[PDB]
Amino acid sequence: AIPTNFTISVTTEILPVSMTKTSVDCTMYICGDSTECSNLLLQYGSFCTQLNRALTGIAVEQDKNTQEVFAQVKQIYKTPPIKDFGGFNFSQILPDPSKPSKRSFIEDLLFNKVTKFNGLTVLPPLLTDEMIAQYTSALLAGTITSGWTFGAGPALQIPFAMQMAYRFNGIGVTQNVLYENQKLIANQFNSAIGKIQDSLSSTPSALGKLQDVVNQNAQALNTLVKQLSSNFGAISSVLNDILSRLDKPEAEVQIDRLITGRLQSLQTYVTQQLIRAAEIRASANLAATKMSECVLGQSKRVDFCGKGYHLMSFPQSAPHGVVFLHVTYVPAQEKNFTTAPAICHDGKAHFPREGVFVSNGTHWFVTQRNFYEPQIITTDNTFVSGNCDVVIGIVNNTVYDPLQPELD
Amino acid sequence: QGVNCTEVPVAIHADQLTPTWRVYSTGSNVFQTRAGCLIGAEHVNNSYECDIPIGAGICASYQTASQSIIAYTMSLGAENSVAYSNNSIAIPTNFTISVTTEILPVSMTKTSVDCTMYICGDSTECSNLLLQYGSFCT
Amino acid sequence: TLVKQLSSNFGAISSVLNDILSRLDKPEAEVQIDRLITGRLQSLQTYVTQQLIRAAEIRASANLAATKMSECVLGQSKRVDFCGKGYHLMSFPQSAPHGVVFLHVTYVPAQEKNFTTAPAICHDGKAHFPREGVFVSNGTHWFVTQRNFYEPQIITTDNTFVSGNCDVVIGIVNNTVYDPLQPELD
Ligand SMILES: CC(=O)N[C@@H]1[C@@H](O)[C@H](O)[C@@H](CO)O[C@H]1O
Ligand SMILES: CC(=O)N[C@@H]1[C@@H](O)[C@H](O)[C@@H](CO)O[C@H]1O
Ligand SMILES: CC(=O)N[C@@H]1[C@@H](O)[C@H](O)[C@@H](CO)O[C@H]1O
Ligand SMILES: CC(=O)N[C@@H]1[C@@H](O)[C@H](O)[C@@H](CO)O[C@H]1O
Ligand SMILES: CC(=O)N[C@@H]1[C@@H](O)[C@H](O)[C@@H](CO)O[C@H]1O
Ligand SMILES: CC(=O)N[C@@H]1[C@@H](O)[C@H](O)[C@@H](CO)O[C@H]1O
Ligand SMILES: CC(=O)N[C@@H]1[C@@H](O)[C@H](O)[C@@H](CO)O[C@H]1O
Ligand SMILES: CC(=O)N[C@@H]1[C@@H](O)[C@H](O)[C@@H](CO)O[C@H]1O
Ligand SMILES: CC(=O)N[C@@H]1[C@@H](O)[C@H](O)[C@@H](CO)O[C@H]1O
Ligand SMILES: CC(=O)N[C@@H]1[C@@H](O)[C@H](O)[C@@H](CO)O[C@H]1O
Ligand SMILES: CC(=O)N[C@@H]1[C@@H](O)[C@H](O)[C@@H](CO)O[C@H]1O
Ligand SMILES: CC(=O)N[C@@H]1[C@@H](O)[C@H](O)[C@@H](CO)O[C@H]1O
Ligand SMILES: CC(=O)N[C@@H]1[C@@H](O)[C@H](O)[C@@H](CO)O[C@H]1O
C-alpha cells in the first residue's frame, strides 16, 4: 500500500519547566517572634539551616531550568517587516508589535487559561514573562527565516518554501512534491494552526499538565500553614497563649511539643518539594532536549515530535512551562499496488534506487515511498546485481535504456 | 527582599547600628526592584549580560560604572536581523573546527554509616534503648 | 552536618552520652539518653533521605554520560546540540575524579556569502530540480552548490531531475541545462 496524498497535522505538547520559588524562614515558621521558643529551637542544632539550604537549592534550579529550555539562542533574531513565507501564515504564533506586552495570540490563550504569610515568602524568577517571550520570538524568527542553520552557527537566510523542501526531503519525500503542492500544503498548515486556537479554547484540560504543578504546590503550602494550628499534644496551638498562661518550667514543655511537631511538618514539606523538584527538573531537561532537536533541527526520532513524520516545531511560552506546536507529515489515501523486489531484464536482476517497484496490473513503475509518483523503469533509477535465479520474488519486465534512442 | 525602599529598611538603624552598617540607608544608591529594596548599587539604564542575578530581570555587577557595583536590566543577547527574502540564500564558504568541553558527574563518594555507633557510640545502655526503635537502623 | 549534630544536645542535659551515664542514675539517664537517641536518629534519617535524593540526580547524570559515550564517541550523533554547538564529527572522552569529560569536535559553517536562488530551472518546458543541492546565482550565471560549503557546479542533467512542467513551480527561473552527451555524439 502506498499513500497518494497527505495531510499536515499540527499538535501541541505541554511540558512543565519550573515551580514557584518558595522559601521558608524556619525559625519564624516554628517560633514566630517568641524569644523563648527560639532559645529552645537552637537545641535542634542545624536542622533549620539545612532546611533553608534545601529550599534555596530548589529555588536556584528553577531558574536553571528556565534558562536551559529557552536561552538556547545566542542572538535575538527578529522577523522581516514583510512576512512573505510562501503562503505560510505565522501571524498567530508571532508577536504583535502594536501591543508592547505581546506574547502572540496563541501565547495569550495559554496565559489566560492557566490560573498573609508567616515565615513563608515567594521569590520572583530571574527571567520575566517578557524576557521569555523574547527568547521564544527569537527562536521562531530563526526557525522561519534561517531554518536550522542558526542552531549550528550563524543564521543563514533561506526562502521559506525552500526550507520546507529540505524538510520534506528529510522525511523521504522528493522536493518536487512540495513545490507542486505548495499552495495545498500552505493551506493545510494555515488551517491546522487555526484549529489549535479552537483546541486550546475548547478543551479546559488541555493545559492540565501545567495546572497540576500549580495546584500541587498550592496544596503543599496550604498544608504547611494549616499544621500551625494542629496543637501537637500541647495545651494550645498558639505559642503566645502558652507563654501568657504558664510559667517558664511549664511552658518549655508545651512549647517543645509544638516545636517538634512543627519541625517535623516543615521537614515533611521540604522533603516533598525536593522530590517534586526532581520531577520538574526531568521535565525541563526533556523540554530543553525537544527545543534543541525539534525546534533547532529536524528530529528523526519516532513520536518524539507528535505523530507522523517531523517537519517543524514552533515553541510558545506558558506560565510555568513551554508549549510546542509540532508540524508533521501524515500519509493519506493509500492504494493497493502489486509489487516485486526486482525486475528480470536480459538475465540481469534490477533493483530500484531509492524507490519501490509497483504495478497497476499491466505496467510496472518505480515509485517513491510515502507519496506514490510512478516513473518508467529505466537504467537511471535501477541498479544491477547478480542474475535472476537468486531473487525469490523477481518478475520479468523491460528496463528502458534512454541512450538507445540517442544512438539509434 | 519584598521590602519597600526607604520606607521599611530604614527601621533597623533606629537602634544606632555600626556606622559601616547604617550606611545602607543613604539615598541615591537606593533602587526599587520587584525582588525588594536594593541598597548600595548604582542603577544604570544600560544593559549587559547577567553577572550576579537579583530577580525580575535585574542583575548586578562590579565595573571598573567605575569602581562600583551597578544594577541593570539584563540583556538577552545581541539584536540580529536575518536578511530574509523570496530568493536570497546565504551559504558558508569556509568553516572552522571547534572543540568544546562537556563535564558530567558520574559518581559520589561511597559513604556508609554504622547507625548504632553513630547514635550510641560504645554505650551498652544506649544500644539497649535503641533496640526499641525496631528496624530503623537496619 | 551529620557530625556536628552529635553535639546538638536535643533537650538533654548534655550532648555527651558518657557524661549523662556517669552523672545520672539508671531511671534518670534513660530519659536524657532517649532525648539524644530521638534527635540523632532523626538527624541520621535526614542525612540518608538527602543522600537518596542526591543519588538519583547523579544516577540521571551517569545515564546521560553513558548515553553520550555511546552516541558521541562510539558513533556520530545527528542530534542537535547533543554534542556541543555545530555539526558533530567526533568526541573524545577523558577521565575525571568523579565524572567524565567529553571533548566534542564539531563543524561550524563560517564566512557566508549572499547568493540569489531558485527552487527550479525551466529548460525546454521541463522543470529541473537539484539533486542533493541548491540552485544559486552570482547574478550572471546559475550553479548547483552543495549545502553547508558552497562549491558551484554547472547545472547539468547529471545533478538535476525533471518533474512536471514549468507552469506549476512558483519561483522557477529560465536557464540552460547542460547535457554532457551532446558533445559526445555531435
Ligand atoms: C489528489 C487529491 O485528492 N488532493 C486533494 C484535493 O483535491 C482536495 O481539494 C484537498 C482538500 O481540499 O485534499 C487533497 O488531498
Ligand atoms: C488561518 C490564518 O492563518 N488566517 C490568517 C489571518 O488571521 C490573517 O489576518 C491574514 C493576514 O493576511 O492571513 C490569514 O492566513
Ligand atoms: C489500500 C487497499 O486498497 N486495501 C485493500 C482493502 O481495502 C481490501 O479490503 C482488501 C481486500 O479485502 O484488499 C486491500 O488491497
Ligand atoms: C491497469 C492500468 O491502470 N493500466 C494503466 C494503462 O491503462 C495506462 O494506459 C498507463 C498509462 O498510459 O498506465 C497504466 O497503469
Ligand atoms: C513474491 C512471490 O512470488 N510470492 C509467491 C506468491 O505469489 C504465491 O502465491 C505463493 C504460493 O505458495 O508463493 C510465494 O513465494
Ligand atoms: C514464472 C515465469 O514467468 N518465469 C519466466 C521464466 O520461465 C523465463 O525463462 C524467464 C526469462 O528467461 O522469465 C521468467 O519470468
Ligand atoms: C515600593 C512601594 O510599593 N511603594 C508604594 C508606592 O508605590 C505607592 O504609591 C504608595 C501609596 O501611594 O505606597 C507605597 O508603599
Ligand atoms: C532612564 C534613565 O535613567 N536615563 C538616564 C538619565 O536620566 C541620566 O541623566 C543620564 C546621565 O548620563 O543617563 C541615563 O541613562
Ligand atoms: C578560503 C579561506 O578563506 N581560507 C582561510 C585561509 O586562507 C586562512 O589561512 C585560514 C586561517 O589561517 O582560514 C581559512 O578559512
Ligand atoms: C551574507 C550577506 O552578504 N548578507 C548581506 C548583509 O551583510 C547586508 O547587510 C544585507 C543588506 O543590508 O544583505 C545581506 O544579503
Ligand atoms: C557576476 C559574476 O561573478 N559572474 C561570474 C563571471 O564573471 C565569471 O566569468 C564566471 C566564471 O567564468 O563565474 C560567474 O559567477
Ligand atoms: C521567488 C519569487 O519569484 N518571488 C517573487 C519576488 O521576487 C517578487 O519581488 C515578489 C513581488 O511581490 O513576488 C514574489 O513571488
Ligand atoms: C518572467 C519571465 O521571464 N517569464 C518567461 C516566460 O515569458 C517565457 O515564456 C518562458 C519560456 O517559455 O520563460 C520564462 O522565464
Numbering used by the authors:
A (entry chain B): 697 to 811, 838 to 1130
B (entry chain A): 597 to 660, 672 to 745
C (entry chain A): 945 to 1130
What does the paper say about this structure?
Samples obtained from two study participants infected with the B1.1.129 variant that were taken on January 12th and 17th of 2021 in Sao Paolo, Brazil, showed a number of identical amino acid S sequences, very different from the global consensus. Apart from several previously described RBD mutations, these sequences contained a modification in the signal peptide next to the N1 loop and two large deletions in the NTD, one in a β -strand preceding the N3 loop (residues 136–144), and another in the N5 loop (residues 258–264). Due to the location of these modifications in the NTD loops, the spike has been named ΔN135. The ΔN135 variant belonging to the B.1.1.294 lineage acquired three large deletions: a 9-residue deletion in N3, a 7-residue deletion in N5, and an N-terminal deletion due to the signal peptide cleavage shift, also leading to the DS15-136 loss. The overall structures of the ΔN135 and ΔN25 trimers are the same as that of the Wuhan spike with the D614G mutation except for the loops in the NTD. ΔN135 variant acquires predominantly the 1-RBD up conformation (73% 1-up, 23% down). Deletion of N1 results in loss of DS15-136 and exposes a hydrophobic patch which contributes to a large reorganization of the NTD loops. The conserved N2 loop has completely shifted position and occupies the space of the deleted N1 loop. The deletion of one of the strands of the N3 beta-hairpin destroys the 3-strand β-sheet βN3N5. As a result, N3 completely shifts and occupies the space of the deleted N1 loop. The loss of DS15-136 and βN3N5 due to the deletions in N1, N3 and N5 causes a dramatic remodeling of the N2, N3, N4 and N5 loops that include the NTD supersites and a reduced stability of the spike. In the ΔN135 spike, N2 and N3 move to the position of the deleted N1 and N4 moves away from the other loops.
S is a large, trimeric glycoprotein that mediates both binding to host cell receptors and fusion of the viral and host cell membranes through its S1 and S2 subunits respectively. The S1 subunit comprises two distinct domains, an N-terminal domain (NTD) and a host cell receptor-binding domain (RBD), that are both targets of neutralizing antibodies with high neutralizing and protective potential. The NTD possesses a galectin fold with five exposed protruding loops (N1-5) and can bind to sialic acid-containing moieties on host cell membranes although this binding specificity has been lost in recent lineages and the exact function of NTD remains unclear. NTD contains a non-glycosylated immunogenic supersite centered around N1, N3, and N5 loops that is a hotspot for spike mutations, including deletions.
